[PDB]
Structure formats: C-alpha cells, structure tokens
Structure 1
Amino acid sequence: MASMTGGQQMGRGSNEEFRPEMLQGKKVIVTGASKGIGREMAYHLAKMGAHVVVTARSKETLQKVVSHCLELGAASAHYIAGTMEDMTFAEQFVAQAGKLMGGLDMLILNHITNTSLNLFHDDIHHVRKSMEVNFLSYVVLTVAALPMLKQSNGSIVVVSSLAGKVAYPMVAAYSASKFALDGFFSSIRKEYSVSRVNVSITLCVLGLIDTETAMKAVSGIVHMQAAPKEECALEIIKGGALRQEEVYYDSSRWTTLLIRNPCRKILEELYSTSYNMDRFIN
C-alpha cells in the first residue's frame, strides 16, 4: 500500500500547529536515550510511528528502551551502544544508524557527560570532558549526519539548558559547553540560510527537569520547581518537527516572559548586511 501512497503532511498551518503524524515514518536518531529526557523522546517517537535509533553507553538499558519502543508502535527500533568521548564511535554511529533506517530525517543531540554541582576550583579534566562530550561530539555527529539530512531536508535538534543562555553557579564547565552549542549552531544556521542547506536547527533551552539524575544532583541545593520529563521530551520533538529555531521549556512563567533576547534578533538582522558571502556559495 505504501508504494501506492503519496503526499505531504506539511501543508497550510504546519508552520505551526503540531500533529503526531508529522513523525510517522520519520527516521530519527536520539542520543543519550537510555534514560531521562532522551528515553522519553524515544517513547514519544515510538507512539508516533517513527523509525528510531537510540544510543548511550549501556546496551542493557538501551535494549529495554528499544523493546518498549516496539511495544509502543515504532515503525522500527534499534540501538548502538558506545561512548560519545570517542569521536570515531560518534562518526561511525551515524553511518550505522542511517544504514539501519535507510536514511535520516531528524538528529536529536541530547547526551551529556555525568556532572554534579560543585564550585569550580581546578578540575580542568571535567572542563575538557564537558567540552568534548557535550559540545565537540555534537559537531562530529552533525558532520557525519549532514549528507543524509541534506537528502531528506531534515532537522538537527540540539538539547541545551537555561544555563546555556544565562550564567548559573556550580555548573561552570557544563554552562560553557551549553553556551558553545548556541554560538556554534546559531552561526552555522546563518551559513545554511545563505548556502541554501534546507536543514533546520532547533536549540532547546530547558529549565530544571524531574529526571532521576538531575533530582539527585541538585537535591538540597537547588530548590526550584522541576518540570515533567514526559512533557519536556514532547516539546523538544514538537520544536524540531515545526522547524523552530529555539524551544523554551521551564516551570516558571517568568522565564518564558524573559529568556527571549529580541535585541540579539535585531542586531543579527542589522549585521546580516555587513557581509558579502558570494565567494563561499556559488
């Protein structure tokens, strides 16, 4: 029947009223998907009927996610276990994931290195690992994924934090890695716009989320209201499906009222006339 079927989900209003059917049959990669928000995203995509490839270091926990994804109604579900500290693994994982699904529509970059709250003193090893895992691997994954994403006019979804937009104590190395994601991905988004690379980039700015690891890490130090992981995961997916540049998800209504930087948007528009990129794209 699929051979005799054709058409498009993305008509009038698909910019921007989300429908779960926008993900039906989509080929999606989810990193850091054995637990937390990543696992919740895998589950939502499964229910939507997407093809899913999940990653994390633990094959046993990834197996459980895959099995549950198949139960939920995933078109297909696979896992490839490995560390995002290993740039060769990051690069080969994408080729292997694309081969399993026959392409790629959405790349969800969610994994981070294990981090606890502490004052910065002399842990350079954690600053470097944070930059390698939380930032550099996202770039390596993007490079490996781009040819397939260009072919499908796909999407890159980057999971960040409010600590990737404002300063927050006790998470300096982590904040540095999240700010780096904004600088990198927002700059290449301008490059893609002028180069006519029809690959959307969604930066997801999340507040505190009720994941097991975050609740343990912040216990007794951060007393703010945590937001539910299930709804968080859905808002990330929605943002990527609607090709939104930025997603904001937090418990506080004051955050939503204040995080947006209209001055940055205006400045970027003003500076867009300061350059002549003709030699780079012809």
Structure 2
Amino acid sequence: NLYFQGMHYQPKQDLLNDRIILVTGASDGIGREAAMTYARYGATVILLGRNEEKLRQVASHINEETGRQPQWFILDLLTCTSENCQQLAQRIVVNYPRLDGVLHNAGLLGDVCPMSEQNPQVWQDVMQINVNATFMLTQALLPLLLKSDAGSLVFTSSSVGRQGRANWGAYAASKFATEGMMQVLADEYQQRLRVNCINPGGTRTAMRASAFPTEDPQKLKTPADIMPLYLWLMGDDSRRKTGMTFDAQPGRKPGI
C-alpha cells in the first residue's frame, strides 16, 4: 500500500483532458477537492452529493477556475434505492457518452466507541452508505464505465479497512467490506476496468476531527496536499494497476 511513496508526482496540466469523471460526496472535504483538482487538470467533472447549496457553490468555484461549469446531481446514499441509482445513471447516459472515472468518496463514520456501545441503528446506516448504496451506485454506473477506453473506478478505504482496531466498529467493518468489493470487481473486470481503493490517511476534514477531537488539525495534511494519488489513479500513468489499495500518505504512520 506504500507503493506511491516518494513518487513526487507532477503530471502535465492536461493530464485529464477528455476524461469524464463522476465524484461522489462532492460538497466539501476530499470530494470537493478531488472534483476541483480533476477539473483543473482538464477533466469533465460530474458532482454527486446530497447538499444542493454546497454543490452549487462547488460548481461555481470550478467554473471560476476553469471556465467550464460541471453539472451536479442529488443522490443521498443513505436513502436511495436501486431504482434511484438506475435513474441517476439514465440521466448521466443522456448527458455523457461514457464515464472514464468514478471516485466513490461519499461515506459515513458513525460511532467511534467500543463494540459493546455501538448504536445498532448507526451501524446499519454506516453499512448502508459505505457498502450497500456504494455497491448499488457502482452497479448502475458499470455500463457507462465500460464505454471508456480505460475506465477507472476508485473506492475510499481506511487503515482500519486493512487491520481492525478497537473502537472503530461499523466504520472498520464497512471499509473491510469495501476492500472486498473492490477485489471482486477488479477480478471481474481484469483488462477492462481499473478498480482500486485509496486510503486518504489522516487528513484535515470534519470526519477526522470527530474521531480525534484532541488532535491539532493543523498538523495534518489538507485534502489539497493529498491529491497526487487521486490524480494518478485517474490519469494514464496508472493504466495497468488494478485490484490494489493505495495510501495517499505512504510516509505517514497511522494514528494521531
């Protein structure tokens, strides 16, 4: 997972020209940063999220920066059905000829507390968003991704998706499930799609702060700082990489 270490990745500024990339959870944090970064490197970006107010602002900011205004679509992973996912895919089909990338960034942390105290309803929400709806949206978007010359599908993992640790409860279970889903898809789509996970590591975001209220967030890298791996997985330089889980901060030791 430390593969990307010492990569010092600085791609051409048009790395993603003519790539159409959908980013979920795009309203703030890592998802907003990824959408803006991909657009700055030339991509046609599609924003997905649940907050119309924030999505409008991200689209406007991207338009100010690139002269091209991305479309946004509302999809709330916690409540959507399979039919809702297929209906979102049909909207994309009408507007875009393919998807060259899908970055699944949407997710829910839920409770950080011992197993004996985990709330079963929160557990089920974490599983619903991180695993089930992420699966359902993937399934709906597979035909679009297969129209790419080399489609790239990326899930969000975590160090606790590789080794479970005390108090990480549903989040850990859901990120192990994500690594599993990713491996099944990579196997089914060998030589057709790239399918991988990214573990962003500790990053300056509201989710991180909720899990570690004592941590000084100024000691963490920002979403901007961890973008090189996100760019690499969408551009041509990662073309024959699939079935892998990569750390965005290979240098960093997990924990506070």
TM-score (ref. length: structure 2): 0.83
Letter in 2 for 1:69: I
CA distance in 2: counterparts of 1:74 and 1:176, whole angstroms: 41
Return the match for 1:133 from 98, 106, 129: 129
Unaligned runs of 5+ in 2: 1-8
Shift, 1:247, TM fit: 2.1
Give RMSD over aligned pairs: 2.5
Alignment of 1:83-122 (within 5 A): 83-85=76-78, 86-87=80-81, 88-113=83-108, 115-120=110-115, 121-122=117-118
Q: Which of the numbers 175, 180, 183 marks the counterpart of 1:178?
A: 175
Structure 1: distance between partners of 2:110 and 2:130: 11
**Is 1:150 matched with 2:146?**
yes
Contact 2:101 2:153 in 1 (8 A): yes
How far is the alpha carbon of 1:77 from its aligned partner? 0.2
Q: Distance between the aligned counterparts of 1:224 and 1:34, measured in 2?
A: 21
2:206 corresponds to: 212
CA contact (8 A) 2:35 2:47 kept: yes
Are residues 151 and 167 of structure 1, via their aligned partners in 2, closer, same or farther at CA, if it must alter by over 3 Å? same
Name 2:27's counterpart in structure 1: 34
Count the aligned residue pairs.
237
Which of 183, 186, 190 aligns to 1:189? It is 186
Give identity over the alignment, percent: 24
- 8 Å contact 1:46–1:52 — kept in the other structure? yes
Q: What does the per-residue CA deviation read over 1:50-76, in whole Å, with 9 as the maximum and x for residues that have no partner?
A: 111111111000000011111121644
Mean CA deviation greater in 51-60 or 207-216: 207-216
Residue 132 of structure 1: how far off its partner (Å): 1.2
Poorly superposed stretches of 4+, deviation over 6 Å: 221-224
Find the structure with the greater CA-based Rg.
Answer: 1
What SS is found at the alignment partner of 1:29? strand
User: 1:38–1:233: 8 Å Cα contact kept in structure 2?
Assistant: no
Contact 2:101 2:151 in 1 (8 A): yes
- 8 Å contact kept, 1:70–1:76: yes
Specify the alignment match of 1:3 in structure 2: none
The normalised TM-score by structure 1 is: 0.76
Task: Say if 1:52 and 1:74, in contact at 8 Å, map to a contact too.
Answer: no
Q: Which runs of 5+ in 1 are unaligned?
A: 1-15, 256-282
Q: Is the 8 A contact 1:58 1:81 kept in 2?
A: yes
Q: Distance in 2 between matches of 1:29 and 1:127?
A: 27
Spell out, residue by residue over 1:86-119, the C-alpha distance to the aligned partner (whole angstroms, 9 max, x if none). Answer: 1333332233234333321101111012534222
Between 1 and 2, higher relative CO (CA 8 Å, sep ≥ 6) is seen in 2
* CA distance in 2 between partners of 1:253 and 1:63 (Å): 34
Q: Distance in 1 between matches of 2:218 and 2:28?
A: 22
Q: 1:127 Cα deviation (Å)?
A: 1.8
Q: Distance in 1 between matches of 2:10 and 2:55?
A: 32
| Preserved contact between residue 205 and residue 248 of structure 1 (Cα < 8 Å) | yes
More helix by share: 1
Residue of 117, 121, 124 corresponding to 2:120: 124
